[PDB]
Amino acid sequence: GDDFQSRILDTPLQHSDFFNVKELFSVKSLFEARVHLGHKAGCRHRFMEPYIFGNRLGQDIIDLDQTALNLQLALNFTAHVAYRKGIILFVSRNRQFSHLIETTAQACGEYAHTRYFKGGLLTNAQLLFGPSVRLPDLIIFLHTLNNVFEPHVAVRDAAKMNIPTVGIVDTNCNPCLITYPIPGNDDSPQAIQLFCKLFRTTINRAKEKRRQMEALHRLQSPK
């Protein structure tokens, strides 16, 4: 009874890679998708220089070794949250990828907000949504800038509500408030499509593992 619930929720945290997210991606896989391509040096943010491999004739290159480490942590965190049945919200204001990101969220079984973000959506949720609305437990920012080249309002508003954030952060972005920053290309269609698949495969694996974990532990109770 109590032991089984503890086993379901406490066992996953005793393994470094319980969901084996390492296999989903590789440095070579990321390099094929152009995830190492950054904005010109003029567009560089000061807090992104740790993640930049260098400047190839004006175009900043993103170290795909730091990206691999950071992506492993971010995908690992996103899996345990999905494993525990938390709400995950995908957020972006890039309109080229609005339909792809909404389609990804639907495939995962989670939520997407790719439209104009209303002021107070998270800090004033009860007014906008109802009395007992449950806020997201994790927000994944595939794009952290809005269409006026400013930080998306939900980056600060998710920190105000103490919600962890997994965000793709290109060379011109500000990763300081992103809980799990993933340095990488956010403009190329092939880079965005790769990240969407990774987050979708990861969430489905974590949801599937929970179903299997419950059946095994549940079956033991009669057996």
Binding site: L89, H99, Q106, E110, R115, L128, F129, P136
Partner: protein
Amino acid sequence: HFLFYTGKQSYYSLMHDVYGKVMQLEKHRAESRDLIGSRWLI
């Protein structure tokens, strides 16, 4: 509904469908007046 947090889940769910239809028609490739004396709903 997956579009709950937009605040207009039904308006944006409909704009999702029509934008996906538009994409398939554009990728896949007569008179358009199949209906006459009609108006768009107010």
